[PDB]
From a paper:
Crystal structures of the apo- and cisplatin-bound Prp8 inteins revealed that two degenerate cisplatin molecules bind at the intein active site. This suggests that an unspliced Prp8 intein likely would interfere with the binding of these RNA elements to the spliceosome, and thus, disrupt spliceosome function. Because inteins frequently interrupt highly conserved sequences of host proteins, they often disrupt functions that are essential for the pathogen’s survival. Therefore, inteins are attractive potential drug targets.
The fungal intein of interest here interrupts the gene encoding pre-mRNA processing factor 8 (Prp8), which is the largest, most conserved, and highly essential protein of the spliceosome responsible for mRNA splicing. The Prp8 intein belongs to the class 1 intein family. The Prp8 intein is one of the most widespread eukaryotic inteins, present in important pathogenic fungi, including Cryptococcus and Aspergillus species.
Numbering used by the authors: 1 to 72, 90 to 118, 132 to 170
The structure:
Amino acid sequence: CLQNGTRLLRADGSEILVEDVQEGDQLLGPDGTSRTASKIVRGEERLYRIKADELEDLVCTHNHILSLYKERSYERVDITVDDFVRLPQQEQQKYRLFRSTATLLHIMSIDLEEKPTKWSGFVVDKDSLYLRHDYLVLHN
């Protein structure tokens, strides 16, 4: 469940707003093969902004699942936004967002927004992973 305005990659490569994703739309997965979106949902609530370096922030709901990498090379970890929020900061520093091109990105901040915001979400088939416009790997 992402903030409205987030741009995802379609199966061809072109962009699409997350609020415009409809039932059966073809998104792009991290392995290059296609993805089918279903069970579109909308809402409005105070979201979490994840500030990473270089890349545009990731604004999502508290129950959103992050696909991250953890140190000690790296191991693949899926963790919800709430649990990651409650993690100690020295533990949070061991996690990395990642994109498909094998680039790692440090999570530098994560905070609750001041005002509510419209958000859209869906579910994805296969490995249930899809790609943001900047090729950031996102989960259901």
